[PDB]
Amino acid sequence: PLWFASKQSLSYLDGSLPGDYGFDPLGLSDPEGTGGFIEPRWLAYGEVINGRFAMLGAVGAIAPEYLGKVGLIPQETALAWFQTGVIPPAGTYNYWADNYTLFVLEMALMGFAEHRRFQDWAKPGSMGKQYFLGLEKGFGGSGNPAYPGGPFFNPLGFGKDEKSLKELKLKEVKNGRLAMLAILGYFIQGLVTGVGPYQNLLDHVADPVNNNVLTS
Amino acid sequence: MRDLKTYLSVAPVASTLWFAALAGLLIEINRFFPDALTF
Amino acid sequence: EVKILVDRDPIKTSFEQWAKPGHFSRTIAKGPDTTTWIWNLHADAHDFDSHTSDLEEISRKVFSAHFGQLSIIFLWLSGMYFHGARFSNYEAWLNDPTHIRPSAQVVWPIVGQEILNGDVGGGFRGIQITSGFFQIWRASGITSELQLYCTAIGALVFAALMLFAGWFHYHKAAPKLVWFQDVESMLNHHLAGLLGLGSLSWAGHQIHVSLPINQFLNAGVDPKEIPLPHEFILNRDLLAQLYPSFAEGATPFFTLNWSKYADFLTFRGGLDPLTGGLWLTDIAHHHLAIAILFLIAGHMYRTNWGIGHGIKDILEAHKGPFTGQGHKGLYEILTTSWHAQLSINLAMLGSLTIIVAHHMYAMPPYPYLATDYGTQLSLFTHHMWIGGFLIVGAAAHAAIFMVRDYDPTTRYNDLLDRVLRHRDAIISHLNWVCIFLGFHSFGLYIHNDTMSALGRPQDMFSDTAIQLQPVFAQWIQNTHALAPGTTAPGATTSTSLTWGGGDLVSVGGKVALLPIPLGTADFLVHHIHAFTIHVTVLILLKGVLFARSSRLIPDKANLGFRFPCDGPGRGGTCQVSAWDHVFLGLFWMYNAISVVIFHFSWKMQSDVWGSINDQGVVTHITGGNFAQSSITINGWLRDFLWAQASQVIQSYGSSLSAYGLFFLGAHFVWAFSLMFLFSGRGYWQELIESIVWAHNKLKVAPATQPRALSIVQGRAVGVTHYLLGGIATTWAFFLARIIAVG
Amino acid sequence: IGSPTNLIMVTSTSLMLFAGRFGLAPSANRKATALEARDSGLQTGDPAGFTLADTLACGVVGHIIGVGVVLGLKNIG
Amino acid sequence: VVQPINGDPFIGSLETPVTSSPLVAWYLSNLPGYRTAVNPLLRGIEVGLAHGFLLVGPFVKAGPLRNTEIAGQAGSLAAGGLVVILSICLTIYGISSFNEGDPSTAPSLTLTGRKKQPDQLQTADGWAKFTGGFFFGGISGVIWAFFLLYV
Ligand code: CLA
Ligand code: CLA
Ligand code: CLA
Ligand code: CLA
Ligand code: CLA
Ligand SMILES: CC1=C(/C=C/C(C)=C/C=C/C(C)=C/C=C/C=C(C)/C=C/C=C(C)/C=C/C2=C(C)CCCC2(C)C)C(C)(C)CCC1
Ligand SMILES: CC1=C(/C=C/C(C)=C/C=C/C(C)=C/C=C/C=C(C)/C=C/C=C(C)/C=C/C2=C(C)CCCC2(C)C)C(C)(C)CCC1
Ligand SMILES: CC1=C(C/C=C(\C)CCC[C@H](C)CCC[C@H](C)CCCC(C)C)C(=O)c2ccccc2C1=O
Ligand code: SF4
């Protein structure tokens, strides 16, 4: 199946790509004259990495909003995405640390993980080489930078054979794409309605005629 | 690094550093001992 | 198939070539035998043509060099915002702009130089600035040094980003040639992208920050008590109380009830009478409409789809009986010659800057700008010079295109060929009209001076004698004044108070703008402008049309663009090169712009600027003396130069004394330039021989053998010091005068 | 609906989309000179050579005509 | 439209709607100076008539007496004075240019290339008679304007 494909995008998207619908109306992954970050191997990785974070975000940016309205987490910890301290002028909350001190711990912890991850893309055999609390036994990657697996990233043994992994990669990709559109949805709905995403889902059921994108 | 040290020695670069150092020296002598007309 | 095409790691990043002066040039790279090497190294540094003949590799150099320039500008803006934040009286100036003098530079106490820290008000001591940054920051709603500090950090970041991109797009990902040649994509992305999304996004700031904050400033509330800009975004009711159109939000926009926004989007015209600048509601409505025009204009040319033109089609379709094939072949020329592109862009960018000079004085776009006579005289003069320099640059690269890129066998064009086929008819016609202009403009002054000297003021070209009234300009003035009620019904008042009619606007007892009268004197000085501009075009256009050949030098194009001459034969051939025409055109550009800015300074001080009374008795700075004085050369000598030079020559002992020193210094540099322009390198090389002998006698001769400057360098050095000394003299003369009396 | 301007906008939008779906205005597979057929390359689920960019083109121009007419009528009567 | 002059693309000129158009070529071939086979004396009389008549205007109306009652007489004398000096320029131009035996230095060919007799205006006597007509014509043309304007 081809989603608005062209007879020049089909020249390089050979189907051997998890989620290869042939969609490329601007010829971005064209292997002719690549360089920088506009590169075929790198763009697939960026699609996956952005897809994985969006899946965590699309759920997490609406989980306290959903769990709170029911009454499952305390009403003083259940928040909309844009009012947790991420955007102080829109909303703050007194965590165990300052809103800026937390970000230092974030970039410190996210640094180690995202730095080591980049070395398996650059030097695949690395990360398992230099000592690291013995944890380097499960940091050798797999020859695939985007699918390292091992005891840390595939501890249960999914993608057991060929027909299972490509069916798993194909579903893993399409979910991130919708979650990315969901992340995109939460953003514009926030600035135009001023209310949370799950509430926007509510008022479109309580009154679909008068609660719409055209009313705002 | 040795290429950089060669460039840092090129006429214009060595001149600004030399004259910058000179200007700082003359300015500070004039801040410490201003308005000297005799000597 | 317009696509991103880039080569990976073309040039290795290494200090190896930093250690090798002149590496870019095969001749220069071998090292100096003589001092002439030192100068050619610099003269050829940016002549990317002479480094490499590959058009792709030339384009990559100009691309990253552009990033270099953008880096420099951002760093320049970083310092401007940083000094406003750290060394200024901007916060004090917001409370009293009619009295406090903008200052954003403070000199350290050394060798007595503290005297340049002047008593400018606001409990501050510093140099009075005329760049106008304060009027900008106010119109942007900037209210504290904290906001300037953050703008300075952002400018510094953008400076690093631009520098990184330059190294990135030359050493890591360098675009291929065909990427640069996609002129359709570029035009679309600049119209819609740069011009369109720039004017739209700036309109957003004007709406949500600049309009509301200036309403509090103009109402009188203290800037420390004005709500921070983000509060007009977090809380719409703050906006709605100033403009009730925001109450309905973005709904009236989509329902085509645009007339609901008529309280913050207007078409008033004239000047905000309590601030002296254009209405900030007219300005915001300007950027709104302007942004729409560019977003749609960026859809004109064809790219990766069907709609749009190929620019080649539009060119190849325009041609007449007098022209033949017309614009065919121009698309190959303007996609293969960087100098042809640079000639047009310099021509238009220069012309546009001169317009910015006029429009910004007659329609002051910043609050409290019109009454800062020092800032406004500086802005008009600054942009005249910038404009005139860029224009003269157009002729050089037009001339450079004819020597290096013009090729009738590969890239023919019948329009260019048709002009080359009658260049003698063009240049002789421009020669005659210049002679006509000169006699019937400057000669009238000489008539007046001679008549006035003989005791015969009835025979002068004067408003009180033989009158030369500029009927056509007078007519246009009276037309625009009647436009708001008639031909422009939506307009409340005229676009400018200059438009001969209306009334007057004052700020703090100082006149901002009134109707500018145009009489006999304005007739004379306007025909001086037409004369001087014509001679500038005569020299420059002649230089490009005979850049390849002439009856005197049939193979001139083989001698290059920049060469001293072809020897004393043929009666003498000094300065036949197109480069020498640019050398001569700079002097005439200097001449023309000098009397333009003199025309501006005298008119404004005489008929516009001044102080208004309690009852409306205006006292102009020089009291209307322009009409009877500016019609003789003696009037400019006596009533303009001799009288207005008072301030600069008595500036010693006061904070304006640095203008005193620059006045004398620029006179010196100007006189020093004449040594180069009047002499010749043969004299100097022989002189140096005797000097070299003396060094040899003491075993102190350099192995880099001293040479006189080349013939061309002598000329370049001459015109450079001539322009620097000349212009700097007027700079020191203008600023001392206008800061002391404005 | 809520307004008669709704009638003017959908008219110009539908009429302009009409002028490009089959003909009487330049499409993405039909450039003009003073209409020469061509091919674009962006396939569609619309079998008339009517492309995705073409719906945006007429959709934008249909609004430019309409808004100019709507505000022209609104500023008169 | 724009052709090479007389079909020769290597002569230093062009043939344009200004140089050679049916109306241009007619009016220029009808001026007294391009009447190549007519008497040069009668050419100069028409030339002097037209110019001396024209010269009365600027002298009278702009001279140092333009706003007085002595205006018409002075600028007319100044107009005739300008004719006197111009007649000396025309005379010395001929004494220097043409000798008492030289043939006409005028073109002996036509636009189509046939041989005609050159304009004897370009000779010593042909010039002497032309400038003699200008002087007589210029003086009477000054008087004729002086006659119509202030009599
Ligand atoms: C006018 C200046 C200019 C131009 C014409 C280009 C042109 C190009 N760059 Mg480049 N670049 C620039 C400035 C410029 N750059 C600057 C300032 C930087 C420093 C940050 C870089 C860093 C850079 C890198 C690291 C890379 C390029 C690449 C490219 C190529 C493909 C770009 C593309 O569409 O990717 C798609 C573009 C994106 C995915 C970016 C979309 C989102 C970003 C953030 C754009 C937002 C910018 C926006 C105008 C700012 C608004 C701010 C406002 C809202 C407050 C192309 C030749 C790429 C390349 O080599 O291709 C072969 C590449 O890898 N550039
Ligand atoms: C166009 C930009 C510009 C200009 C013309 C100035 C000009 C000035 N600034 Mg300013 N400034 C700017 C940008 C600018 N600034 C920016 C962007 C910042 C923010 C980072 C500042 C922050 C700043 C501060 C904090 C201060 C000034 C001060 C001053 C004044 C004295 C400076 C002095 O003597 O330095 C001393 C001279 C030197 C340091 C030069 C040393 C000579 C070396 C040898 C040259 C090195 C050359 C080398 C080869 C190239 C190095 C490049 C490298 C940067 C990568 C002077 C009027 C001072 C002032 O106003 O005091 C009242 C002051 O205290 N500025
Ligand atoms: C440290 C980083 C670095 C290094 C090692 C190199 C190394 C090299 N580059 Mg590269 N480059 C870099 C950063 C770097 N580049 C950046 C940031 C850019 C963007 C502008 C470029 C753009 C670039 C281009 C466009 C070209 C190179 C070229 C070169 C080669 C020789 C250049 C040379 O002689 O430089 C020594 C040059 C200088 C020290 C000049 C100083 C540069 C700045 C911008 C001057 C600004 C001064 C400013 C005007 C103030 C002065 C005025 C006032 C004092 C009066 C060499 C392989 C050239 C090459 O390979 O061609 C054969 C070439 O054409 N590079
Ligand atoms: C965007 C504008 C632009 C650009 C990109 C260029 C680019 C170029 N020009 Mg051009 N030009 C321009 C504007 C521009 N010009 C204008 C406005 C004029 C009119 C003045 C000219 C006149 C001109 C001539 C006459 C010539 C060029 C040449 C060149 C080429 C070589 C430049 C070089 O290596 O110089 C290296 C740069 C220098 C050696 C700098 C010299 C120092 C300057 C002259 C003094 C500056 C004084 C300063 C403002 C005050 C500080 C004083 C203080 C230090 C005390 C290059 C393609 C040359 C060529 O042959 O092209 C192939 C050439 O002969 N141009
Ligand atoms: C004040 C000094 C001065 C003067 C008067 C001139 C005059 C002239 N320059 Mg010149 N020039 C100068 C400085 C000067 N230049 C300098 C310093 C440079 C170096 C950059 C140049 C470089 C330069 C170039 C490169 C060009 C000129 C051109 C011209 C001519 C312009 C056409 C014109 O107005 O003719 C009319 C003449 C005048 C207005 C001069 C005054 C005439 C008086 C007032 C009338 C006298 C009436 C009568 C004769 C009385 C005398 C009687 C007596 C015999 C008894 C003109 C002859 C251009 C040219 O030839 O174009 C045709 C041209 O291309 N000049
Ligand atoms: C001053 C300065 C600075 C700053 C700047 C800034 C601050 C900026 C900002 C900017 C911004 C912040 C911007 C924004 C932008 C935006 C935009 C541009 C948007 C657009 C939009 C659109 C285009 C729309 C669309 C649409 C339509 C049309 C319809 C409906 C739908 C929608 C809405 C989607 C710096 C530091 C650099 C430097 C120095 C100086
Ligand atoms: C396919 C199909 C169909 C159809 C569909 C429809 C009917 C639709 C339509 C379509 C559409 C519905 C489209 C439209 C579009 C639109 C657009 C695309 C728009 C745009 C706009 C804009 C862009 C605007 C902007 C602007 C301007 C221009 C001016 C100024 C102002 C503003 C900003 C507003 C049917 C069902 C039959 C069947 C099946 C198939
Ligand atoms: C005066 C001048 C001379 C001589 C002036 C030249 C030689 C300039 C000398 C420039 C510098 C001062 C030479 C020394 C440069 C060294 C870098 C100085 C090193 C010493 C330290 C202080 C840096 C000629 O070359 C001539 C050229 C053709 C037309 C007329 C002119 C012109 O009139
Ligand atoms: S004087 Fe100088 S420029 Fe003039 S010809 Fe002789 S050498 Fe060449």
Give a three-class secondary structure readout of chain D: CCCCHHHHHHHHHHHHHHHHHCCCCCECCEECCCCEECCCCCCCCCCCCCCHHHHHHHHHHHHHHHHHHHHHHHCCC
SS3 category, C703: coil
From C392, C346, C432, select the one nearest C592 (Cα to Cα). Answer: C392
| Residues pairing with D36 in the sheet | D31
Q: Which residues of A touch C7 (CB under 8 A)?
A: 33, 35
Q: Hey, what long-range contacts does E85-93 have (CB within 8 A, 24 or more apart)?
A: E86/E134, E86/E138, E87/E131, E87/E134, E87/E135, E87/E138, E90/E127, E90/E130, E90/E131, E90/E134, E90/E135, E91/E128, E91/E131, E93/E127, E93/E131
Residue C256 · residue D71 · CB < 8 Å: yes
Mark yes or no for CB contact C6/A33 under 8 Å: yes
Only one residue has tokens 């514009």, namely A188
Is A87 annotated among the ligand-binding residues? yes
Only one residue has tokens 């214009």, namely B12
* C-beta neighbour count of C617 within 10 angstroms: 9
User: For chain E, percent helix, then strand, then coil, each to nearest 5?
Assistant: 60, 5, 35
Amino acid at A210: N
Of the candidates D5, D57, D64, which has its C-beta nearest C307's C-beta? Answer: D57
Residue C173 · residue A36 · CB < 8 Å: yes
What is the DSSP pairing of strand C619-620 with strand E14-15? unpaired
For ligand 4, which residues put their CB under 6 angstroms from it? Answer: C 42-47, 49, 342, 346, 389-390, 392-393, 396, 400, 561-562, 579, 582, 720
Q: What is the dihedral of CA C561, C567, C570, C574, to 10 degrees?
A: 60
**C518, two tokens:** 């145009």
**C243, two tokens:** 């403009």
Mark yes or no for CB contact B6/C110 under 8 Å: no
Mark yes or no for CB contact B3/C14 under 8 Å: yes
Spatial separation of the C-alpha atoms in residues C558 and C296, rounded to whole Å: 46
Of the candidates C256, C305, C307, which has its C-beta nearest D71's C-beta? Answer: C256
The backbone torsions φ and ψ at residue C513, rounded to the nearest 5 degrees and listed phi first, read -145, 145
Mark yes or no for CB contact C15/B34 under 8 Å: no
**C709, two tokens:** 């400057």
Is D39 annotated among the ligand-binding residues? no
Determine the straight-line distance between the first and last CA of chain A, rounded to whole angstroms. Answer: 37
Query: B12 in contact with C at a CB cutoff of 8 Å?
Result: no
Mark yes or no for CB contact E64/C422 under 8 Å: no
Distance C211 CA to ligand 6 centre (A): 17
- Residues 6 or more apart whose CB falls under 8 angstroms from that of C16 comprise B3
Of the candidates C15, C110, C111, which has its C-beta nearest B7's C-beta? Answer: C15
**C503, two tokens:** 């009334």
Spatial separation of the C-alpha atoms in residues A42 and C499, rounded to whole Å: 61
Of the candidates C322, C422, C425, which has its C-beta nearest E1's C-beta? Answer: C322
**B5, two tokens:** 């040290």
Q: Which residues of C touch B6 (CB under 8 A)?
A: 18-19
Residue C73 · residue C161 · CB < 8 Å: no
* C-beta neighbour count of C413 within 10 angstroms: 20
The backbone torsions φ and ψ at residue C527, rounded to the nearest 5 degrees and listed phi first, read -80, -15
Q: What is the dihedral of CA C260, C263, C265, C268, to 10 degrees?
A: 120
Residue C558 · residue C404 · CB < 8 Å: no
The 8-class DSSP code of residue C615 comes to S
The backbone torsions φ and ψ at residue C270, rounded to the nearest 5 degrees and listed phi first, read 70, -155
Is A115 annotated among the ligand-binding residues? no
Instruction: Calculate how close chain C gets to A168, using CA atoms only, in Å.
Output: 32
For ligand 7, which residues put their CB under 6 angstroms from it? Answer: C 292; D 13, 17, 46, 55-56, 59-60, 63-64
Q: Chains contacting B with at least 3 CB pairs below 8 Å?
A: C
- Catalogue all structural domains in chain E, each as residue range(s) with its CATH number: 3-150 (1.20.1240.10)
Residues in chain D, how many? 77
**A67, two tokens:** 């769990």
Spatial separation of the C-alpha atoms in residues C142 and C164, rounded to whole Å: 29
Give the distance from CA C586 to its chain's centroid.
Answer: 15
SS3 category, C510: strand
The 8-class DSSP code of residue C455 comes to T
Spatial separation of the C-alpha atoms in residues C94 and B34, rounded to whole Å: 38
- CA nearest D30 in C: which residue? C306
- What does this entry list as its resolution, in Å? 2.4
Q: What ranges do the domains of chain D cover?
A: 1-77
Residue C564 · residue C710 · CB < 8 Å: yes
Only one residue has tokens 């009647």, namely C482
| Residues pairing with C610 in the sheet | C620
CB-ligand 1 contact for A37 (6 Å cutoff): yes
Mark yes or no for CB contact C16/B30 under 8 Å: no
Strand ranges inside C579-724, DSSP E: 610-611, 619-620
**C726, two tokens:** 């000349």
Q: Angle between the C711-741 and C578-603 helix axes, to the nearest 10 degrees?
A: 10
Query: B17 in contact with C at a CB cutoff of 8 Å?
Result: no
Interface test with C, best of A32, A92, A212, A213 (most C CBs within 10 A): A32
Distance C106 CA to ligand 2 centre (A): 13
Residue C144 · residue C91 · CB < 8 Å: yes
The 8-class DSSP code of residue C267 comes to -
Distance C28 CA to ligand 3 centre (A): 17
Instruction: Calculate how close chain A gets to D43, using CA atoms only, in Å.
Output: 6
Instruction: Calculate how close chain A gets to D48, using CA atoms only, in Å.
Output: 16
CATH superfamily of B1-39: Single helix bin (1.20.5.510)
The 8-class DSSP code of residue A170 comes to H
**B1, two tokens:** 């690094």
Query: D43 in contact with A at a CB cutoff of 8 Å?
Result: yes
CB-ligand 3 contact for C63 (6 Å cutoff): no
Mark yes or no for CB contact A4/D41 under 8 Å: no
Only one residue has tokens 């130089």, namely C113
Spatial separation of the C-alpha atoms in residues A98 and A108, rounded to whole Å: 15
**C50, two tokens:** 């002479």
Spatial separation of the C-alpha atoms in residues A71 and C552, rounded to whole Å: 97
A-D CB pairs within 8 A amount to 13
* CA distances from residue C582 to C393, C547, C592 in whole angstroms, order as listed: 8, 11, 15
Mark yes or no for CB contact D38/C306 under 8 Å: yes
C-D CB pairs within 8 A amount to 35
Only one residue has tokens 């503290």, namely C114
Spatial separation of the C-alpha atoms in residues C734 and C742, rounded to whole Å: 11
Ligand 5 binding pocket mutation candidate from C433, C439, C540, C676 (most atoms within 8 A of CB): C439
Only one residue has tokens 């008219």, namely D11
* C-beta neighbour count of C353 within 10 angstroms: 19
The angle formed by the CA atoms of residues C118, C119 and C123, to the nearest 5 degrees, is 125
The radius of gyration computed from the CA coordinates of chain D, to the nearest angstrom, equals 15
Give chain A's contact residues with D (Cβ, < 8 Å): 2, 4-8, 25
SS3 category, C148: helix
Query: E11 in contact with C at a CB cutoff of 8 Å?
Result: no
* CA distances from residue C361 to C283, C526, C601, E67 in whole angstroms, order as listed: 16, 18, 12, 42
Mark yes or no for CB contact C322/E14 under 8 Å: no
Query: A34 in contact with C at a CB cutoff of 8 Å?
Result: yes
| Residues pairing with C334 in the sheet | none
**What HEC string does C325-391 produce?**
CCCCCHHHHCCCCHHHHHHHHHHHHHHHHHHHHHHHHHCCCCCCCCCCHHHHHHHHHHHHHHHHHHH
Q: Are there at least 3 beta-carbon pairs closer than 8 Å between A and E?
A: no
Q: What ranges do the domains of chain C cover?
A: 1-742
What is the residue with the minimal CA distance to atom 17 of ligand 6? Answer: C201
Spatial separation of the C-alpha atoms in residues A134 and D53, rounded to whole Å: 56
**What HEC string does C386-431 produce?**
HHHHHHHHHHHHHHHHHHHCCECCCECCHHHHHHHCCHHHHHHHHH
Spatial separation of the C-alpha atoms in residues C48 and C63, rounded to whole Å: 12
Count Cα neighbours of C318 within 13 Å in the Cβ-side half-sphere: 10
Is D21 annotated among the ligand-binding residues? yes
Residues 285 through 344 of chain C touching chain D, CB cutoff 8 Å: 296, 305-307
Interface test with B, best of C17, C18, C35, C107 (most B CBs within 10 A): C18
Spatial separation of the C-alpha atoms in residues D23 and D1, rounded to whole Å: 29
Q: Angle between the E40-62 and E71-97 helix axes, to the nearest 10 degrees?
A: 140
Is D29 annotated among the ligand-binding residues? no
* CA distances from residue B7 to B1, C14, C15, C17, C361 in whole angstroms, order as listed: 10, 12, 8, 9, 48
Q: Are there at least 3 beta-carbon pairs closer than 8 Å between C and E?
A: yes
Let me know if C346 is exposed, middle or buried by CB neighbors in 10 A (0-12, 13-18, 19+). buried
Of the candidates C6, C234, C250, which has its C-beta nearest A36's C-beta? Answer: C6
Indicate which ligand has the atom closest to the C-alpha of C575: 9
Distance C115 CA to ligand 2 centre (A): 21
Spatial separation of the C-alpha atoms in residues C192 and C54, rounded to whole Å: 31
Amino acid at C202: W
Mark yes or no for CB contact D42/A25 under 8 Å: yes
* C-beta neighbour count of A50 within 10 angstroms: 15
| Residues pairing with C611 in the sheet | C510, C619
Is A29 annotated among the ligand-binding residues? yes
Spatial separation of the C-alpha atoms in residues C625 and C640, rounded to whole Å: 10
